[PDB]
mmCIF file of C-alpha atoms (C1' of nucleotides) and ligand atoms in Angstrom:
data_model
loop_
_atom_site.group_PDB
_atom_site.id
_atom_site.type_symbol
_atom_site.label_atom_id
_atom_site.label_comp_id
_atom_site.label_asym_id
_atom_site.label_seq_id
_atom_site.Cartn_x
_atom_site.Cartn_y
_atom_site.Cartn_z
ATOM 1 C CA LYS A 92 -30.609 46.004 20.833
ATOM 2 C CA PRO A 93 -28.296 48.939 21.677
ATOM 3 C CA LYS A 94 -26.626 46.859 24.397
ATOM 4 C CA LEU A 95 -26.230 43.867 22.069
ATOM 5 C CA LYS A 96 -23.827 45.739 19.802
ATOM 6 C CA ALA A 97 -22.082 46.961 22.948
ATOM 7 C CA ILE A 98 -21.628 43.413 24.230
ATOM 8 C CA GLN A 99 -20.292 42.200 20.868
ATOM 9 C CA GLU A 100 -17.945 45.189 20.965
ATOM 10 C CA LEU A 101 -16.737 45.025 24.562
ATOM 11 C CA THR A 102 -16.129 41.265 24.544
ATOM 12 C CA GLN A 103 -13.274 41.990 22.137
ATOM 13 C CA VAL A 104 -11.194 42.872 25.215
ATOM 14 C CA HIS A 105 -9.311 40.009 26.933
ATOM 15 C CA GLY A 106 -10.977 39.202 30.268
ATOM 16 C CA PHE A 107 -14.415 40.561 29.365
ATOM 17 C CA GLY A 108 -17.189 38.103 28.596
ATOM 18 C CA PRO A 109 -20.912 38.747 27.993
ATOM 19 C CA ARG A 110 -21.471 39.123 31.737
ATOM 20 C CA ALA A 111 -18.858 41.847 32.316
ATOM 21 C CA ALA A 112 -19.808 43.652 29.107
ATOM 22 C CA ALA A 113 -23.442 43.922 30.235
ATOM 23 C CA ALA A 114 -22.426 45.363 33.612
ATOM 24 C CA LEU A 115 -20.269 47.971 31.855
ATOM 25 C CA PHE A 116 -23.216 49.008 29.691
ATOM 26 C CA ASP A 117 -25.748 49.044 32.543
ATOM 27 C CA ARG A 118 -23.678 50.506 35.390
ATOM 28 C CA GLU A 119 -21.237 52.657 33.408
ATOM 29 C CA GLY A 120 -23.066 53.524 30.189
ATOM 30 C CA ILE A 121 -19.918 52.409 28.385
ATOM 31 C CA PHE A 122 -20.737 51.032 24.930
ATOM 32 C CA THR A 123 -17.454 51.090 22.993
ATOM 33 C CA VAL A 124 -13.983 49.634 23.475
ATOM 34 C CA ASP A 125 -12.513 53.132 22.966
ATOM 35 C CA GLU A 126 -14.450 54.455 25.969
ATOM 36 C CA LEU A 127 -13.432 51.470 28.111
ATOM 37 C CA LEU A 128 -9.740 52.153 27.403
ATOM 38 C CA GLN A 129 -9.905 55.881 28.156
ATOM 39 C CA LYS A 130 -11.890 55.272 31.376
ATOM 40 C CA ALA A 131 -10.561 51.976 32.816
ATOM 41 C CA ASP A 132 -8.407 53.664 35.476
ATOM 42 C CA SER A 133 -11.477 55.387 36.954
ATOM 43 C CA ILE A 134 -13.344 52.081 37.244
ATOM 44 C CA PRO A 135 -12.557 50.329 40.552
ATOM 45 C CA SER A 136 -14.522 47.106 40.033
ATOM 46 C CA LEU A 137 -12.224 45.924 37.222
ATOM 47 C CA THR A 138 -9.985 43.037 38.236
ATOM 48 C CA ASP A 139 -6.216 42.948 37.730
ATOM 49 C CA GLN A 140 -6.618 40.515 34.808
ATOM 50 C CA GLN A 141 -9.110 42.722 32.944
ATOM 51 C CA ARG A 142 -6.717 45.621 33.456
ATOM 52 C CA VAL A 143 -3.981 43.791 31.549
ATOM 53 C CA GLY A 144 -6.356 43.116 28.655
ATOM 54 C CA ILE A 145 -7.115 46.820 28.478
ATOM 55 C CA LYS A 146 -3.536 48.077 28.832
ATOM 56 C CA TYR A 147 -2.244 45.684 26.142
ATOM 57 C CA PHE A 148 -5.238 45.962 23.773
ATOM 58 C CA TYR A 149 -3.114 47.026 20.777
ATOM 59 C CA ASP A 150 -0.428 44.324 21.281
ATOM 60 C CA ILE A 151 -2.953 41.556 21.965
ATOM 61 C CA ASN A 152 -4.765 42.113 18.650
ATOM 62 C CA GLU A 153 -1.559 41.693 16.598
ATOM 63 C CA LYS A 154 -0.585 38.218 15.329
ATOM 64 C CA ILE A 155 2.883 36.709 15.876
ATOM 65 C CA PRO A 156 4.844 35.786 12.702
ATOM 66 C CA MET A 157 6.371 32.285 12.743
ATOM 67 C CA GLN A 158 9.899 33.747 12.676
ATOM 68 C CA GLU A 159 9.285 35.499 16.001
ATOM 69 C CA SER A 160 7.768 32.379 17.617
ATOM 70 C CA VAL A 161 11.040 30.590 16.785
ATOM 71 C CA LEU A 162 12.800 33.309 18.813
ATOM 72 C CA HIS A 163 10.397 32.873 21.773
ATOM 73 C CA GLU A 164 11.020 29.120 21.640
ATOM 74 C CA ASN A 165 14.814 29.540 21.732
ATOM 75 C CA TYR A 166 14.638 32.169 24.491
ATOM 76 C CA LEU A 167 12.402 30.122 26.809
ATOM 77 C CA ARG A 168 14.516 26.974 26.249
ATOM 78 C CA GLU A 169 17.726 28.824 27.064
ATOM 79 C CA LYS A 170 16.304 30.465 30.221
ATOM 80 C CA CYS A 171 14.816 27.142 31.335
ATOM 81 C CA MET A 172 18.271 25.501 31.104
ATOM 82 C CA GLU A 173 19.890 28.431 32.950
ATOM 83 C CA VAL A 174 17.602 28.529 35.987
ATOM 84 C CA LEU A 175 16.048 25.014 36.129
ATOM 85 C CA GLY A 176 18.844 22.894 34.614
ATOM 86 C CA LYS A 177 18.929 19.724 32.505
ATOM 87 C CA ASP A 178 16.084 17.960 34.379
ATOM 88 C CA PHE A 179 13.559 20.248 32.640
ATOM 89 C CA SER A 180 12.506 21.051 29.074
ATOM 90 C CA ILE A 181 10.335 23.516 27.109
ATOM 91 C CA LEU A 182 8.150 22.644 24.082
ATOM 92 C CA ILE A 183 6.086 25.187 22.105
ATOM 93 C CA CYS A 184 2.746 23.834 20.819
ATOM 94 C CA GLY A 185 -0.420 25.621 19.633
ATOM 95 C CA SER A 186 -0.854 26.844 16.039
ATOM 96 C CA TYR A 187 2.928 27.290 15.801
ATOM 97 C CA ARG A 188 3.446 23.511 16.037
ATOM 98 C CA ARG A 189 0.614 23.196 13.457
ATOM 99 C CA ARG A 190 2.923 25.263 11.179
ATOM 100 C CA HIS A 191 0.652 28.291 10.749
ATOM 101 C CA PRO A 192 2.486 31.339 9.336
ATOM 102 C CA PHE A 193 0.977 33.397 12.206
ATOM 103 C CA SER A 194 -0.150 32.600 15.766
ATOM 104 C CA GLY A 195 -2.272 34.428 18.339
ATOM 105 C CA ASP A 196 -0.139 33.568 21.394
ATOM 106 C CA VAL A 197 2.731 31.381 22.629
ATOM 107 C CA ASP A 198 1.641 27.997 24.101
ATOM 108 C CA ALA A 199 4.443 26.388 26.100
ATOM 109 C CA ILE A 200 4.729 23.108 28.035
ATOM 110 C CA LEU A 201 7.232 22.899 30.883
ATOM 111 C CA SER A 202 8.044 19.327 31.961
ATOM 112 C CA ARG A 203 10.702 17.074 33.514
ATOM 113 C CA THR A 204 12.637 14.901 31.058
ATOM 114 C CA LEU A 205 12.506 11.098 30.814
ATOM 115 C CA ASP A 206 16.010 10.998 32.348
ATOM 116 C CA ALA A 207 15.192 13.159 35.409
ATOM 117 C CA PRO A 208 14.891 11.297 38.713
ATOM 118 C CA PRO A 209 11.329 10.613 39.954
ATOM 119 C CA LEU A 210 9.932 12.873 42.700
ATOM 120 C CA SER A 211 7.929 11.843 45.801
ATOM 121 C CA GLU A 212 5.233 14.523 45.259
ATOM 122 C CA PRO A 213 3.468 16.228 42.310
ATOM 123 C CA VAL A 214 5.992 18.407 40.451
ATOM 124 C CA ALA A 215 3.616 21.350 40.851
ATOM 125 C CA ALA A 216 4.119 21.153 44.628
ATOM 126 C CA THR A 217 7.814 22.083 44.267
ATOM 127 C CA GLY A 218 6.891 25.674 43.285
ATOM 128 C CA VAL A 219 8.937 25.287 40.092
ATOM 129 C CA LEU A 220 6.535 27.152 37.773
ATOM 130 C CA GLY A 221 6.685 30.146 40.105
ATOM 131 C CA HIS A 222 10.491 30.006 40.217
ATOM 132 C CA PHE A 223 10.672 29.979 36.395
ATOM 133 C CA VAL A 224 8.211 32.892 36.190
ATOM 134 C CA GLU A 225 10.198 34.968 38.730
ATOM 135 C CA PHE A 226 13.377 34.397 36.695
ATOM 136 C CA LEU A 227 11.694 35.591 33.459
ATOM 137 C CA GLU A 228 10.345 38.632 35.325
ATOM 138 C CA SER A 229 13.844 39.579 36.583
ATOM 139 C CA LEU A 230 15.018 39.526 32.947
ATOM 140 C CA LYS A 231 12.142 41.855 31.963
ATOM 141 C CA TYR A 232 10.786 39.259 29.509
ATOM 142 C CA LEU A 233 7.554 38.686 31.478
ATOM 143 C CA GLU A 234 6.131 42.157 32.164
ATOM 144 C CA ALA A 235 2.493 41.630 33.191
ATOM 145 C CA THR A 236 0.445 38.768 34.687
ATOM 146 C CA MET A 237 -3.172 37.867 33.855
ATOM 147 C CA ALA A 238 -3.504 34.697 35.966
ATOM 148 C CA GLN A 239 -1.104 32.382 37.807
ATOM 149 C CA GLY A 240 -1.349 29.175 39.840
ATOM 150 C CA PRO A 241 0.894 26.138 40.381
ATOM 151 C CA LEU A 242 -0.036 24.507 37.027
ATOM 152 C CA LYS A 243 -0.807 27.379 34.641
ATOM 153 C CA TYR A 244 0.655 30.841 33.988
ATOM 154 C CA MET A 245 -0.855 33.467 31.631
ATOM 155 C CA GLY A 246 0.911 36.801 31.032
ATOM 156 C CA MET A 247 2.625 39.163 28.580
ATOM 157 C CA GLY A 248 6.159 38.392 27.404
ATOM 158 C CA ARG A 249 8.366 40.652 25.268
ATOM 159 C CA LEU A 250 11.696 39.692 23.661
ATOM 160 C CA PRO A 251 14.518 42.112 24.570
ATOM 161 C CA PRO A 252 15.589 44.647 21.907
ATOM 162 C CA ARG A 253 17.963 43.250 19.278
ATOM 163 C CA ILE A 254 20.829 45.297 17.818
ATOM 164 C CA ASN A 263 19.537 49.544 13.800
ATOM 165 C CA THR A 264 17.719 48.406 16.961
ATOM 166 C CA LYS A 265 14.652 46.165 16.696
ATOM 167 C CA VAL A 266 12.024 46.647 19.435
ATOM 168 C CA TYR A 267 9.373 43.916 19.923
ATOM 169 C CA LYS A 268 5.668 43.887 20.812
ATOM 170 C CA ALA A 269 4.584 42.235 24.061
ATOM 171 C CA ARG A 270 2.899 38.858 23.344
ATOM 172 C CA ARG A 271 0.453 36.597 25.175
ATOM 173 C CA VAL A 272 2.484 33.793 26.743
ATOM 174 C CA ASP A 273 0.829 30.722 28.327
ATOM 175 C CA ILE A 274 2.948 28.180 30.268
ATOM 176 C CA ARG A 275 1.568 24.808 31.489
ATOM 177 C CA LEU A 276 3.520 22.594 33.913
ATOM 178 C CA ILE A 277 2.952 18.889 33.074
ATOM 179 C CA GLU A 278 4.095 15.580 34.659
ATOM 180 C CA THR A 279 6.541 13.497 32.582
ATOM 181 C CA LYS A 280 4.175 10.543 31.952
ATOM 182 C CA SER A 281 1.532 13.039 30.737
ATOM 183 C CA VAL A 282 3.691 14.694 28.065
ATOM 184 C CA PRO A 283 2.393 12.803 24.971
ATOM 185 C CA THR A 284 -1.254 13.525 25.828
ATOM 186 C CA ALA A 285 -0.391 17.152 26.728
ATOM 187 C CA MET A 286 1.322 17.588 23.349
ATOM 188 C CA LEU A 287 -1.955 16.483 21.739
ATOM 189 C CA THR A 288 -4.100 18.782 23.882
ATOM 190 C CA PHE A 289 -1.994 21.924 23.645
ATOM 191 C CA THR A 290 -1.340 21.507 19.917
ATOM 192 C CA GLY A 291 -5.071 21.332 19.107
ATOM 193 C CA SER A 292 -6.793 22.723 17.185
ATOM 194 C CA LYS A 293 -9.725 23.211 19.547
ATOM 195 C CA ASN A 294 -12.120 21.435 17.155
ATOM 196 C CA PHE A 295 -9.631 18.592 16.689
ATOM 197 C CA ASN A 296 -9.476 18.023 20.486
ATOM 198 C CA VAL A 297 -13.266 17.917 20.730
ATOM 199 C CA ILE A 298 -13.489 15.354 17.887
ATOM 200 C CA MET A 299 -10.754 13.160 19.423
ATOM 201 C CA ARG A 300 -12.324 13.387 22.901
ATOM 202 C CA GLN A 301 -15.701 12.388 21.399
ATOM 203 C CA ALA A 302 -14.015 9.379 19.764
ATOM 204 C CA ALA A 303 -12.638 8.443 23.199
ATOM 205 C CA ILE A 304 -16.113 8.684 24.763
ATOM 206 C CA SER A 305 -17.574 6.417 22.058
ATOM 207 C CA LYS A 306 -15.014 3.727 22.973
ATOM 208 C CA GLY A 307 -15.359 4.014 26.749
ATOM 209 C CA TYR A 308 -12.324 6.247 27.363
ATOM 210 C CA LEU A 309 -11.588 9.614 28.967
ATOM 211 C CA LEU A 310 -8.964 11.704 27.110
ATOM 212 C CA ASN A 311 -7.385 14.861 28.586
ATOM 213 C CA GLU A 312 -3.910 16.439 28.833
ATOM 214 C CA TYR A 313 -2.976 14.128 31.707
ATOM 215 C CA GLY A 314 -3.651 10.783 30.041
ATOM 216 C CA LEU A 315 -5.840 8.288 28.187
ATOM 217 C CA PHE A 316 -8.025 6.446 30.732
ATOM 218 C CA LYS A 317 -10.099 3.307 30.076
ATOM 219 C CA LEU A 318 -13.354 3.724 31.997
ATOM 220 C CA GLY A 319 -15.224 0.699 30.639
ATOM 221 C CA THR A 320 -18.964 0.531 29.974
ATOM 222 C CA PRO A 321 -21.215 3.632 30.292
ATOM 223 C CA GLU A 322 -22.454 2.447 33.703
ATOM 224 C CA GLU A 323 -19.054 1.517 35.141
ATOM 225 C CA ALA A 324 -18.038 5.103 34.361
ATOM 226 C CA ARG A 325 -20.888 6.616 36.379
ATOM 227 C CA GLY A 335 -16.348 17.916 41.162
ATOM 228 C CA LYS A 336 -13.944 20.403 39.602
ATOM 229 C CA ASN A 337 -12.763 17.927 36.970
ATOM 230 C CA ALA A 338 -12.821 14.191 36.167
ATOM 231 C CA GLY A 339 -10.474 13.491 39.102
ATOM 232 C CA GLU A 340 -7.084 15.246 39.157
ATOM 233 C CA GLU A 341 -5.332 17.327 41.831
ATOM 234 C CA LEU A 342 -2.184 19.415 41.237
ATOM 235 C CA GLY A 343 -1.866 17.826 37.784
ATOM 236 C CA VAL A 344 -2.001 14.208 39.022
ATOM 237 C CA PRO A 345 -4.983 11.849 38.605
ATOM 238 C CA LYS A 346 -6.401 10.436 41.853
ATOM 239 C CA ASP A 347 -5.484 6.768 42.361
ATOM 240 C CA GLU A 348 -8.888 5.451 41.245
ATOM 241 C CA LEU A 349 -8.451 7.200 37.882
ATOM 242 C CA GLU A 350 -4.704 6.547 37.612
ATOM 243 C CA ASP A 351 -5.499 2.809 37.843
ATOM 244 C CA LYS A 352 -7.417 3.188 34.549
ATOM 245 C CA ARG A 353 -4.475 4.701 32.649
ATOM 246 C CA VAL A 354 -3.435 3.235 29.315
ATOM 247 C CA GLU A 355 0.244 4.170 29.149
ATOM 248 C CA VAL A 356 1.339 5.905 25.937
ATOM 249 C CA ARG A 357 4.731 7.105 24.664
ATOM 250 C CA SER A 358 3.662 8.940 21.491
ATOM 251 C CA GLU A 359 0.768 10.873 19.943
ATOM 252 C CA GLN A 360 0.495 8.017 17.415
ATOM 253 C CA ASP A 361 -0.242 5.591 20.281
ATOM 254 C CA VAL A 362 -3.391 7.583 21.146
ATOM 255 C CA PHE A 363 -4.679 7.686 17.547
ATOM 256 C CA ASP A 364 -4.135 3.895 17.335
ATOM 257 C CA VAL A 365 -5.981 2.955 20.544
ATOM 258 C CA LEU A 366 -8.891 5.178 19.484
ATOM 259 C CA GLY A 367 -9.016 3.702 15.974
ATOM 260 C CA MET A 368 -8.305 7.029 14.239
ATOM 261 C CA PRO A 369 -5.883 7.591 11.328
ATOM 262 C CA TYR A 370 -2.739 9.466 12.407
ATOM 263 C CA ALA A 371 -2.726 13.155 11.450
ATOM 264 C CA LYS A 372 0.396 15.347 11.407
ATOM 265 C CA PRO A 373 0.076 18.562 13.486
ATOM 266 C CA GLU A 374 -0.253 20.670 10.310
ATOM 267 C CA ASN A 375 -3.312 18.599 9.374
ATOM 268 C CA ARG A 376 -5.168 19.151 12.651
ATOM 269 C CA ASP A 377 -7.465 22.008 11.579
ATOM 270 C CA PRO A 378 -10.915 20.408 11.074
ATOM 271 C "C1'" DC B 1 -19.933 30.532 37.844
ATOM 272 C "C1'" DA B 2 -16.910 33.746 34.310
ATOM 273 C "C1'" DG B 3 -13.574 33.729 31.216
ATOM 274 C "C1'" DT B 4 -9.969 31.635 28.727
ATOM 275 C "C1'" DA B 5 -7.006 27.432 27.073
ATOM 276 C "C1'" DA C 1 -14.734 17.783 25.579
ATOM 277 C "C1'" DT C 2 -12.283 18.800 29.298
ATOM 278 C "C1'" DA C 3 -9.492 21.859 32.293
ATOM 279 C "C1'" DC C 4 -7.245 26.065 35.475
ATOM 280 C "C1'" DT C 5 -7.480 30.442 37.930
ATOM 281 C "C1'" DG C 6 -10.172 34.210 40.009
HETATM 282 C C1 D3T D 401 -9.663 27.553 23.002
HETATM 283 C C2 D3T D 401 -9.280 26.164 23.322
HETATM 284 C C3 D3T D 401 -8.012 25.634 23.160
HETATM 285 N N1 D3T D 401 -7.714 24.322 23.484
HETATM 286 C C4 D3T D 401 -6.331 23.807 23.255
HETATM 287 C C5 D3T D 401 -6.151 23.495 21.751
HETATM 288 C C6 D3T D 401 -5.254 24.621 21.283
HETATM 289 C C7 D3T D 401 -4.492 25.020 22.568
HETATM 290 C C8 D3T D 401 -4.092 26.548 22.525
HETATM 291 O O1 D3T D 401 -5.161 27.342 22.640
HETATM 292 P P1 D3T D 401 -5.257 28.647 21.426
HETATM 293 O O2 D3T D 401 -6.514 29.275 21.960
HETATM 294 O O3 D3T D 401 -4.000 29.321 21.861
HETATM 295 O O4 D3T D 401 -5.338 27.740 20.175
HETATM 296 P P2 D3T D 401 -4.266 27.945 18.816
HETATM 297 O O5 D3T D 401 -4.730 26.701 18.116
HETATM 298 O O6 D3T D 401 -2.948 27.840 19.505
HETATM 299 O O7 D3T D 401 -4.462 29.221 17.985
HETATM 300 P P3 D3T D 401 -3.880 30.819 18.097
HETATM 301 O O8 D3T D 401 -3.094 31.013 16.818
HETATM 302 O O9 D3T D 401 -3.015 30.896 19.319
HETATM 303 O O10 D3T D 401 -5.162 31.628 18.225
HETATM 304 O O11 D3T D 401 -5.405 24.766 23.640
HETATM 305 C C9 D3T D 401 -8.743 23.435 23.993
HETATM 306 O O12 D3T D 401 -8.500 22.285 24.268
HETATM 307 N N2 D3T D 401 -10.044 23.979 24.155
HETATM 308 C C10 D3T D 401 -10.249 25.249 23.830
HETATM 309 O O13 D3T D 401 -11.496 25.733 23.999
HETATM 310 MG MG1 MG D 402 -2.177 29.438 20.674
HETATM 311 NA NA1 NA D 403 -13.174 38.818 25.701
#
DNA sequence: CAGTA
DNA sequence: ATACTG
C-alpha cells in the first residue's frame, strides 16, 4: 500500500499519471509531491511538459475568479485582432461560459468568421495557431509551453501587471483552432461540462449519429456505421465522413436533432 | 499507449 | 464519448 498513497499524491502534479507516479516511487524512491519539486532538476527522464507542471505547481492549484477570466477574454480578443486581423475571432468557453464564479483554466476557441473568405486547405495548415502563439510569447503573456501542435496549444499565460501595482498569477491557457463550419459543435464540446458531453454523445449514438467538436454526422444503422479518431485530419473530416454531416448553425440545432431539451450553458452541470 | 481536454 | 500531442 505505501506506493498507493504515493501514486494518489504524485498524480496531483500536471503531467503525471499513475504510470509516471509508479516509476518515480520505484526508480527514485520519491513518495511525496514536496520531494518531487525539490528534486525535479536532478531527474533527467522527466519530459518538458512534466517540468512545467512542477515549476508552476503553486499557480496551477489556484482557481481563476470570473473577473480575471473577463480580462483574459478581452486580452486574447485584442491581441487576435492586432496580429491576425478581422478574419479571426476568439471565444472563451469552459466553466467560465457556464457562469461559474471560479474556473480551473482558460478554454479558448480560435476560428475564422462567417464573413472571412474560404481557404483552399485546412486552416491549421496555414500555421496560424503558431503565429498567434509566437505573438503572445513576444508580449510575455505566454511564458511556458506544455504541448503544442497545429490544432491545440496548452501553456501558461499571465496578464501583464496593472497600475498600487497588481501582479497576476500565471494561468493554464488552452487554445483550440477550429474550422468555421465546426464552430457551433465546438462551442458545445469546449463548454461542457465533461459529463454533459458524454450524455449528449450517448444520445447521438442511440439515434445513429456521431457527435464531436467538428460536427454532427448521421451514420445510419449500427451496421452501416461499422485509427486515431473517427476520421479527421488537421481538423477536417475525411470526405466519407464529411458526406454524412448534418449542417448546424446553433447549439440549439444539435439539441433539436437529438431530441433533447435545450439547456443554457449555466445548466450544463449534470 | 499516457496524460489531459 | 471522443479527441490532440508526446
Ligand atoms: C476533461 C474533459 C473535458 N472535456 C471538454 C468539456 C469541458 C472542456 C474544458 O475542459 P476542463 O477540463 O477545462 O473543463 P471545465 O468544465 O472548463 O472546468 P475547469 O473549471 O476548467 O476545471 O473540455 C471533454 O470533452 N472531455 C473531458 O474528459
Ligand atoms: Mg476549463
Ligand atoms: Na496529474
